[PDB]
Design a protein around this ligand. Structure first.
Ligand code: HEM
Ligand SMILES: NC(=[NH2+])NCCC[C@H](N)C(=O)NCP(=O)(O)O
Length: 244
C-alpha cells in the first residue's frame, strides 16, 4: 500500500507493463546522474545523500491518477515527513512522474509540476503553518504540507542548458523538509561555502551559470517559489506571479 521506497525497495514498485513499471529504470538513470565521476554532479549534497542511503523515492503514474496519483502521493509525503525527522537531517524524497513523455517542452513540465502541487494541497490533513505567510505573493511564502514548509524543485529532460536539472526521462519532483539546510543558512560561514562549492560544480557541468533567483550567494533568498521551477535561460519571473 505504501509507495515510499528506499533504494533497495524501488524494484518492487512495478515490473514490466504495469503501473510504475518504468520507475526502476528512472531510478537507475537518476543514480547514474548523481553518482557520476567526471564531471561530478554539481550538488555534492545530493551525491552524498545518495552515497549515504539518505534518499527515498516515490512516483506518480499519470495513466492512473485515481490510484497512483496525488492522493497516494499525499500519503507517501506524510510517511516521508516522519522519516525525514526520525533519520538524518540531510534526506531527500525524489518523486518520478511518468511514464516519460517524448519531446515535452519545459513549460509543459513546469505546468504539470504546479498542477501536482495544487492537487496535493487538497489532500493535506494539517492546517497551514502559522509561521509561513499564506499569500503566495509574500516574499517569505514557501510551499507547505503536513504542517511545515518544504523546499521543492522540478527536474525535467527538457532542461538542455541547465543540465544539472535533467535527472532522467521523467519530470522529477525533489522534496526536502527545511531541516536539510540547518547549519548552512545564508549568513553562515558554512552556508556561503556550500553555495561556492555547488556553484563551482555548476560551472563545470552546465551550459549556463547559476540562475539569478538563487541570489548573489552571500545571503539568504526570498521569493523561493521562483527557484522551484528555474527556466533554462536567464529570464526572471515576476515575484508576485507564483502559479499556485
Ligand atoms: C538528490 C538530492 C539533491 C539534488 C538532485 C540536488 C540538486 C541541486 C541542484 C540542481 C542545484 C543547483 C541549483 C538549482 O538548480 O536549484 C543544487 C544546489 C544546492 N543544493 Fe542540492 N540537491 C540535492 C540535495 C541537497 C541537499 C540534501 C542539500 C542540503 C544541504 C542541498 C543543498 C544545496 C545547496 C546549498 C545548493 C546551492 C544553492 C546556491 O548556490 O544558491 N542539496 N542542488
Ligand atoms: N536546488 C536548490 N536550489 N537547493 C538549495 C535550496 C536552498 C533553499 N532555498 C534555502 O532555504 N536555503 C537557505 P538560505 O539561508 O535561504 O540560503
Amino acid at each position: 500500500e505504501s509507495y515510499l521506497w528506499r533504494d533497495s525497495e524501488v524494484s518492487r514498485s512495478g515490473s514490466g507493463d504495469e503501473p510504475f513499471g518504468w520507475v526502476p529504470e528512472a531510478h537507475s538513470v537518476f543514480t547514474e546522474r548523481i553518482l557520476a565521476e567526471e564531471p561530478p554532479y554539481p550538488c555534492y549534497f545530493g551525491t552524498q545523500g545518495q552515497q549515504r542511503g539518505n534518499n527515498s523515492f516515490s512516483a506518480v503514474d499519470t495513466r492512473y491518477p485515481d490510484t497512483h496519483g496525488p492522493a497516494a502521493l499525499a500519503r507517501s509525503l506524510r510517511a516521508y515527513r516522519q522519516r525525514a525527522w526520525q533519520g538524518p537531517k540531510r534526506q531527500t524524497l525524489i518523486v518520478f512522474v511518468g511514464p516519460a513523455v517524448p519531446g515535452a517542452e519545459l513549460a509543459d513540465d513546469h505546468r504539470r509540476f504546479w498542477t501536482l502541487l495544487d492537487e496535493l494541497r487538497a489532500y493535506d490533513t494539517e492546517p497551514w503553518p502559522a509561521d509561513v505567510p499564506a499569500d503566495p505573493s509574500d516574499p517569505r511564502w514557501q510551499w507547505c504540507f503536513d504542517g511545515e514548509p518544504w523546499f521543492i524543485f522540478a527536474a525535467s529532460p527538457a532542461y538542455k542548458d541547465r543540465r544539472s536539472r535533467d535527472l532522467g526521462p521523467c519530470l522529477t519532483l525533489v522534496f526536502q523538509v527545511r531541516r536539510v539546510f540547518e547549519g548552512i543558512g545564508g549568513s553562515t560561514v558554512a552556508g556561503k561555502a556550500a553555495k561556492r562549492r555547488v556553484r563551482e560544480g555548476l560551472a563545470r557541468y552546465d551550459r549556463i551559470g547559476p540562475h539569478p533567483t538563487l541570489g548573489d550567494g552571500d545571503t539568504s533568498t526570498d521569493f523561493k517559489w521562483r527557484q522551484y521551477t528555474l527556466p533554462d535561460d536567464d529570464s526572471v519571473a515576476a515575484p508576485d506571479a507564483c502559479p499556485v
